[PDB]
């Protein structure tokens, strides 16, 4: 074998050439990505086992299909799954189930996406033992299809702004559910429009005229025999979307819809008859980014276009510094997000507040940067990237789908207020860098180190400076007599910059922490190169804040630029292998341009010839119109 | 009668309230956008006239339709157009034809998109008088449908790397066309897959062993009676795309396909039997303005959250963060439109080099702003009811920077060798001496020209910097082309900064030329937002050599937040001045009337999946699954 385990006999030599320069075992790196050799190996085994079960394959390429054909096809494979799933995976393992759903069901949705993601978790957390026996067992056994219904046409975020009401009728020990206005319709919950016959519904609970706030209710939506909407229910699909169109996102409305008292989920809240009241997404974005970069980098290895040296043949587009600049920094982010994800789990289980605030900034920054990199990846493909044969446009649309940052801003201002009042020592571990002293300048290129740590210290400085600066603007406006909320709005762009910089600092530290923990020397040097590209690209991307107070000099910025272009060149021999280490099959990746074998051009021609418009040589638009038009002329 | 001419009785008061604060006549601003009162008025008249012709309206909302239904529907409206077009527009005018196609055919394509854009122009420029008489007349009369076929699956657009051959057969006075391998297939020409029965085809011409290089040929593709591909032709659609799916982009291949000698287009080149041999900018501006119309109008009716906790939920247009993500892109939309007009002004009176950077910078900043506009809509922007996603996909579907970099290095080399005085007008700022610092906030006025001078400094510093890196590597013995590649990210930064400097100057030039003072102050506010947002976006280069101080950057930040607040009363009116009808804009969230929520409910109720209460996926699969369990 070669170090790159994805090489095969007959693979486009242009691609194989990029794999043969690998300096590390791609199986070892896969273990590092997915958290152990056993987890990496089980992914590959699951992939091999599916190859032997064609009843679970895409019946035809998904871009060929209409939305109606995708939903039927997804429903078909779903039924085969519930039957054959145990021959392939261990169903208790989330991870094997996630991977199985990627190979079989893809990224565009399925009719039970929210059954396992929201509906069942909600019954674990909120429903009482007695209630779980009745409803959770049926969900687990796929006797019912359900979803979680919270956001409303006019109010998506805050639970405290919802309008749907659940009024307790003491006289009939029932809860009355009502959608008082159009803006109170449940709107967006996946699989609510057509697939689910039950839903856990959030509504404000009223007893004797008092609002006890948001609670959750088990709500029958459709008759279990006929599947038609029950009396009082208004329910349907919200229409087509930019992507993710296999999911039937729903609208839902109630006209004085009555449910029993005991359909209130009552694990932590009780309402008695008389009325008495007693009281992972990150690794998803990483994979999406890695999908698109697999496609664009592999394509860039086989696509030859233009000359550098005019005495030499046309070069792979992977050869241009401009093309490396638009791909390789986003390979680094993909790994950085994955390790930031593992870190938050490691920290979440070390909670045997710093974390919930940081969680907000991550979901936002990771999603924005993933989108930027995916769209960079599509453009790196040139015109062919525009085709659904690249599939990057659908990857973009699924991955991409302001209050998270301002939640972190509140925490950062509260933290800044601790500093300015001499209470630096009360800061949580994740925000203590705010209370620390900066040296007069960055010591990048001015102190020998082997050390990313001078980069981390620079990121700590600018993130700290922007937080204290944005917090001071907010405080200054109040000291001048602005109302608190108006001073906050007038400061809010600056406070978001602070929140992003805090979040991006965490992603760097988490990346660096992982590289330090690795013992395998070839794995460590390859990720060390990735990390060195990361910190230079990110520091350059936020250079304004370092330069603004003299903390960084023009000379040091030229060093960072020289380092950036060096590590582009340094990563190139490993670029394809770093992406092969994520180990996506074709059946999972669903991209002609990103085929494992590199045989783009012959398979792009098969793909086009067999695409729907080519069923007949003469289209109906030419039969009915157009040809009668030419004849008349 | 209000200054804002888009207001109507019955409109959502929340939207009307944003329109009533307008400080200028929106008809006057529309004349300023489209280049005269008569051009603005003709757009509105065309719009009114279509309202009286329902045959040409969308039969149903376009997102409801499959690709196959869109093509039928586009073909239907195309035939009605060829009949009724003269009772609406003057067909000779490209502006009126462009607007008519926007209202009727939209942004997603049509079966004859390249018939008028490439096919007929190609016959004007390359076909002889004799040839035009037989082929151009038929094209003009829509007796044939044609396209222009150049780019190949494996090579793109550089003419010297194409592989389709046209070999002259002296013995039969025919040209033999051949696709020698898969990568030589014509691939991407719009309307080539299914619609066109003719095409002008680029191929390398061979006479007796010798390659005379790329020439163009009139090539029959499909029989005029049956529309089936002629013997030797391989032709079809390349498959679905991320957007623009009404166009049937094609692949085309030849197996020793023979055409007469006189199908070579022979206006400027002749081959005898003997064998002898003798703007897009305004388009992107409009797309950006589409999306901002949608997101800003939506932001006027969409209430969400509180500022003051004793007051009702505020329009999201109220948050500085939402103004920051919309208003700078309103400024760009106007800036691109004026940069476009300037480019025409200069073209009719260096320029070709600048043209490259504009096509690239305008397209990418337009994409950034359109996607920014979609996110400003929140979750509802994800629906096709916003339509911004399709706007993005069509707009983004438009080496350009390199062409400008070569010009900027050639310019920088003139400076370094003491030949500053030989620089063209558009690039002379490179030879000029900078003052020790920026004088923003440092002089009693100075105004926009101090911003322009700062942009000239940083664009000049990055060009000279990137050019020196390239020269330095050669002075150290690198081959020219390798030194170029190693410098090419820096050289692209230089090209963008040059291009963005031009957009600023053009914007400023227009504001100076305007006499109408209410129009001038509204665009002056837009310009002041522009220069602060742009200078802040490229602040690194100003700070790097001490040319700007931290204090001056805080001034720019205070100016940015001031002009956000200053522009808000005019934001909706600045976008209404582009004067897009609903039939053109095709967005539920961006409805002229502001009645989003009622019409989003109508749109969803009447969407395809709601034809029946029970889907076939539930009948065939999901309910048998639940029953079994």
Tab-separated table of C-alpha atoms in Angstrom, chain A residues 332-576:
chain	number	residue	atom	x	y	z
A	332	UNK	CA	-7.507	24.151	7.688
A	333	UNK	CA	-10.841	25.525	8.925
A	334	UNK	CA	-12.560	22.186	8.354
A	335	UNK	CA	-10.085	20.469	10.669
A	336	UNK	CA	-10.244	23.441	13.052
A	337	UNK	CA	-14.037	23.241	13.346
A	338	UNK	CA	-13.883	19.473	13.915
A	339	UNK	CA	-11.372	19.863	16.753
A	340	UNK	CA	-13.289	22.825	18.187
A	341	UNK	CA	-16.299	20.511	18.219
A	342	UNK	CA	-14.460	17.750	20.085
A	343	UNK	CA	-13.239	20.385	22.530
A	344	UNK	CA	-16.720	21.650	23.388
A	345	UNK	CA	-17.800	18.087	24.117
A	346	UNK	CA	-14.684	17.612	26.244
A	347	UNK	CA	-15.521	20.813	28.117
A	348	UNK	CA	-19.263	20.059	28.333
A	349	UNK	CA	-18.501	16.781	30.112
A	350	UNK	CA	-15.939	18.593	32.322
A	351	UNK	CA	-18.982	20.421	33.734
A	352	UNK	CA	-19.139	17.635	36.325
A	353	UNK	CA	-21.811	29.573	31.606
A	354	UNK	CA	-18.489	30.283	29.925
A	355	UNK	CA	-19.581	27.453	27.642
A	356	UNK	CA	-23.192	28.297	26.813
A	357	UNK	CA	-22.150	31.803	25.805
A	358	UNK	CA	-19.283	30.514	23.655
A	359	UNK	CA	-21.654	27.965	22.098
A	360	UNK	CA	-23.620	30.867	20.602
A	361	UNK	CA	-20.638	32.439	18.850
A	362	UNK	CA	-19.492	29.073	17.496
A	363	UNK	CA	-22.786	28.148	15.837
A	364	UNK	CA	-22.707	31.562	14.128
A	365	UNK	CA	-19.023	31.910	13.180
A	366	UNK	CA	-18.623	28.268	12.114
A	367	UNK	CA	-21.706	28.531	9.884
A	368	UNK	CA	-20.661	31.818	8.246
A	369	UNK	CA	-17.090	30.663	7.594
A	370	UNK	CA	-18.304	27.287	6.339
A	371	UNK	CA	-20.496	29.113	3.827
A	372	UNK	CA	-17.655	31.374	2.713
A	373	UNK	CA	-15.425	28.343	2.137
A	374	UNK	CA	-18.052	26.256	0.360
A	375	UNK	CA	-18.757	29.099	-2.085
A	376	UNK	CA	-15.015	29.616	-2.511
A	377	UNK	CA	-14.882	25.910	-3.352
A	378	UNK	CA	-17.604	26.181	-5.996
A	379	UNK	CA	-15.846	29.099	-7.714
A	380	UNK	CA	-12.549	27.195	-7.643
A	381	UNK	CA	-14.275	24.754	-9.999
A	382	UNK	CA	-14.888	27.373	-12.660
A	383	UNK	CA	-17.871	27.051	-14.946
A	384	UNK	CA	-18.312	23.344	-14.238
A	385	UNK	CA	-18.917	24.290	-10.603
A	386	UNK	CA	-22.179	25.885	-11.760
A	387	UNK	CA	-23.549	22.473	-12.763
A	388	UNK	CA	-25.386	20.245	-10.336
A	389	UNK	CA	-22.658	17.809	-11.412
A	390	UNK	CA	-20.413	19.618	-8.929
A	391	UNK	CA	-23.206	19.407	-6.285
A	392	UNK	CA	-21.498	22.194	-4.291
A	393	UNK	CA	-24.501	24.506	-4.701
A	394	UNK	CA	-26.729	22.075	-2.791
A	395	UNK	CA	-24.001	21.569	-0.188
A	396	UNK	CA	-23.896	25.346	0.241
A	397	UNK	CA	-27.664	25.637	0.569
A	398	UNK	CA	-27.987	22.966	3.246
A	399	UNK	CA	-24.989	24.130	5.276
A	400	UNK	CA	-26.145	27.754	5.379
A	401	UNK	CA	-29.622	26.959	6.770
A	402	UNK	CA	-27.557	37.759	14.989
A	403	UNK	CA	-29.026	36.926	18.397
A	404	UNK	CA	-26.458	34.200	19.015
A	405	UNK	CA	-23.664	36.769	18.784
A	406	UNK	CA	-25.353	39.349	21.031
A	407	UNK	CA	-25.918	36.654	23.652
A	408	UNK	CA	-22.138	36.199	23.714
A	409	UNK	CA	-21.725	39.981	23.709
A	410	UNK	CA	-23.751	40.271	26.920
A	411	UNK	CA	-21.377	37.741	28.481
A	412	UNK	CA	-18.312	39.600	27.181
A	413	UNK	CA	-19.484	42.985	28.481
A	414	UNK	CA	-20.307	41.426	31.857
A	415	UNK	CA	-16.785	39.989	31.728
A	416	UNK	CA	-15.300	43.340	30.748
A	417	UNK	CA	-17.148	45.004	33.638
A	418	UNK	CA	-15.469	42.544	36.018
A	419	UNK	CA	-12.056	43.595	34.691
A	420	UNK	CA	-12.636	47.342	34.919
A	421	UNK	CA	-13.858	47.015	38.542
A	422	UNK	CA	-10.797	45.077	39.700
A	423	UNK	CA	-12.494	41.658	39.721
A	424	UNK	CA	-10.341	40.034	37.025
A	425	UNK	CA	-9.828	37.004	39.288
A	426	UNK	CA	-13.552	36.093	39.095
A	427	UNK	CA	-13.408	35.374	35.344
A	428	UNK	CA	-14.186	31.900	34.076
A	429	UNK	CA	-11.376	29.913	32.444
A	430	UNK	CA	-12.505	30.649	28.891
A	431	UNK	CA	-12.543	34.433	29.346
A	432	UNK	CA	-9.645	34.962	31.749
A	433	UNK	CA	-7.406	36.219	28.932
A	434	UNK	CA	-9.375	39.463	29.228
A	435	UNK	CA	-7.908	40.049	32.677
A	436	UNK	CA	-4.336	39.362	31.583
A	437	UNK	CA	-1.586	41.794	30.631
A	438	UNK	CA	-0.373	42.140	27.062
A	439	UNK	CA	3.279	42.646	26.260
A	440	UNK	CA	4.061	45.903	24.407
A	441	UNK	CA	4.072	44.228	20.978
A	442	UNK	CA	3.467	40.924	19.294
A	443	UNK	CA	6.555	38.704	19.404
A	444	UNK	CA	5.852	36.978	16.103
A	445	UNK	CA	9.141	36.939	14.152
A	446	UNK	CA	10.793	38.734	17.075
A	447	UNK	CA	11.385	35.752	19.375
A	448	UNK	CA	12.553	32.225	18.416
A	449	UNK	CA	10.034	29.687	19.550
A	450	UNK	CA	8.732	26.920	17.319
A	451	UNK	CA	5.677	28.648	18.576
A	452	UNK	CA	2.144	29.101	17.551
A	453	UNK	CA	1.884	30.460	21.108
A	454	UNK	CA	3.037	33.908	19.973
A	455	UNK	CA	0.177	33.806	17.463
A	456	UNK	CA	-2.304	32.761	20.165
A	457	UNK	CA	-1.069	35.643	22.306
A	458	UNK	CA	-1.653	38.037	19.403
A	459	UNK	CA	-5.197	36.728	18.988
A	460	UNK	CA	-5.752	37.110	22.722
A	461	UNK	CA	-4.594	40.722	22.489
A	462	UNK	CA	-6.845	41.834	19.640
A	463	UNK	CA	-9.878	39.920	20.929
A	464	UNK	CA	-9.300	41.463	24.352
A	465	UNK	CA	-8.757	44.940	22.917
A	466	UNK	CA	-11.944	44.838	20.840
A	467	UNK	CA	-14.031	43.543	23.751
A	468	UNK	CA	-12.795	46.224	26.155
A	469	UNK	CA	-13.175	48.819	23.395
A	470	UNK	CA	-16.717	47.806	22.444
A	471	UNK	CA	-17.675	47.462	26.118
A	472	UNK	CA	-16.332	50.960	26.797
A	473	UNK	CA	-18.355	52.462	23.950
A	474	UNK	CA	-21.468	50.923	25.508
A	475	UNK	CA	-20.512	52.162	28.975
A	476	UNK	CA	-19.487	55.576	27.658
A	477	UNK	CA	-22.844	56.196	26.018
A	478	UNK	CA	-24.675	55.380	29.257
A	479	UNK	CA	-22.289	57.566	31.267
A	480	UNK	CA	-23.441	60.313	28.846
A	481	UNK	CA	-27.084	59.523	29.636
A	482	UNK	CA	-28.280	57.215	26.867
A	483	UNK	CA	-30.897	54.667	27.836
A	484	UNK	CA	-29.258	51.268	28.275
A	485	UNK	CA	-30.982	49.592	25.331
A	486	UNK	CA	-30.287	52.461	22.928
A	487	UNK	CA	-26.624	52.621	23.928
A	488	UNK	CA	-26.552	48.875	23.281
A	489	UNK	CA	-27.938	49.173	19.751
A	490	UNK	CA	-25.516	51.989	18.921
A	491	UNK	CA	-22.634	49.737	20.052
A	492	UNK	CA	-23.851	46.485	18.569
A	493	UNK	CA	-21.709	46.213	15.426
A	494	UNK	CA	-18.601	46.687	17.573
A	495	UNK	CA	-19.879	44.167	20.124
A	496	UNK	CA	-20.370	41.579	17.366
A	497	UNK	CA	-16.788	42.064	16.180
A	498	UNK	CA	-15.731	41.352	19.766
A	499	UNK	CA	-17.903	38.217	19.857
A	500	UNK	CA	-16.487	36.825	16.602
A	501	UNK	CA	-12.885	37.487	17.648
A	502	UNK	CA	-13.489	35.701	20.956
A	503	UNK	CA	-14.990	32.769	19.062
A	504	UNK	CA	-12.216	32.626	16.453
A	505	UNK	CA	-9.606	32.743	19.228
A	506	UNK	CA	-11.175	29.628	20.756
A	507	UNK	CA	-11.047	27.770	17.435
A	508	UNK	CA	-7.324	28.513	17.175
A	509	UNK	CA	-6.520	27.402	20.736
A	510	UNK	CA	-8.538	24.195	20.291
A	511	UNK	CA	-6.693	23.417	17.043
A	512	UNK	CA	-3.345	24.041	18.758
A	513	UNK	CA	-4.328	21.966	21.802
A	514	UNK	CA	-5.022	18.975	19.544
A	515	UNK	CA	-1.713	19.197	17.669
A	516	UNK	CA	0.127	19.201	20.999
A	517	UNK	CA	-1.704	16.080	22.178
A	518	UNK	CA	-0.815	13.967	19.110
A	519	UNK	CA	2.067	11.512	19.442
A	520	UNK	CA	2.173	10.012	15.923
A	521	UNK	CA	4.914	12.146	14.399
A	522	UNK	CA	3.858	12.162	10.739
A	523	UNK	CA	0.260	12.973	11.677
A	524	UNK	CA	1.460	15.764	13.941
A	525	UNK	CA	3.678	17.460	11.347
A	526	UNK	CA	0.907	17.415	8.725
A	527	UNK	CA	-1.579	19.025	11.122
A	528	UNK	CA	1.168	21.345	12.389
A	529	UNK	CA	1.538	22.585	8.812
A	530	UNK	CA	-2.238	23.023	8.609
A	531	UNK	CA	-2.206	24.931	11.907
A	532	UNK	CA	0.601	27.235	10.732
A	533	UNK	CA	-1.412	28.050	7.606
A	534	UNK	CA	-4.486	28.644	9.786
A	535	UNK	CA	-2.917	31.162	12.172
A	536	UNK	CA	-1.277	33.183	9.400
A	537	UNK	CA	-4.428	33.284	7.269
A	538	UNK	CA	-6.618	34.174	10.255
A	539	UNK	CA	-4.207	36.745	11.687
A	540	UNK	CA	-3.953	38.354	8.240
A	541	UNK	CA	-7.751	38.348	8.000
A	542	UNK	CA	-8.006	40.367	11.233
A	543	UNK	CA	-4.830	42.413	10.809
A	544	UNK	CA	-6.572	45.795	11.280
A	545	UNK	CA	-7.043	45.146	15.003
A	546	UNK	CA	-3.396	44.179	15.492
A	547	UNK	CA	-2.088	47.211	13.590
A	548	UNK	CA	-4.463	49.767	15.077
A	549	UNK	CA	-2.634	50.242	18.391
A	550	UNK	CA	0.906	49.438	17.238
A	551	UNK	CA	0.784	45.913	18.671
A	552	UNK	CA	1.897	44.638	15.244
A	553	UNK	CA	4.236	46.346	12.790
A	554	UNK	CA	4.214	46.448	8.995
A	555	UNK	CA	7.357	44.280	9.029
A	556	UNK	CA	5.673	41.601	11.141
A	557	UNK	CA	2.704	41.629	8.738
A	558	UNK	CA	5.050	40.976	5.814
A	559	UNK	CA	6.378	38.037	7.831
A	560	UNK	CA	2.819	36.725	8.160
A	561	UNK	CA	2.318	37.110	4.406
A	562	UNK	CA	5.575	35.296	3.627
A	563	UNK	CA	4.487	32.566	6.053
A	564	UNK	CA	1.080	32.302	4.355
A	565	UNK	CA	2.549	31.748	0.901
A	566	UNK	CA	5.111	29.334	2.305
A	567	UNK	CA	2.545	27.073	3.947
A	568	UNK	CA	0.343	27.063	0.852
A	569	UNK	CA	3.303	25.523	-0.974
A	570	UNK	CA	4.038	23.309	2.046
A	571	UNK	CA	0.502	21.912	2.301
A	572	UNK	CA	0.052	21.168	-1.421
A	573	UNK	CA	1.697	17.690	-1.476
A	574	UNK	CA	-0.719	16.733	1.320
A	575	UNK	CA	-3.835	18.656	0.256
A	576	UNK	CA	-5.673	15.809	-1.495
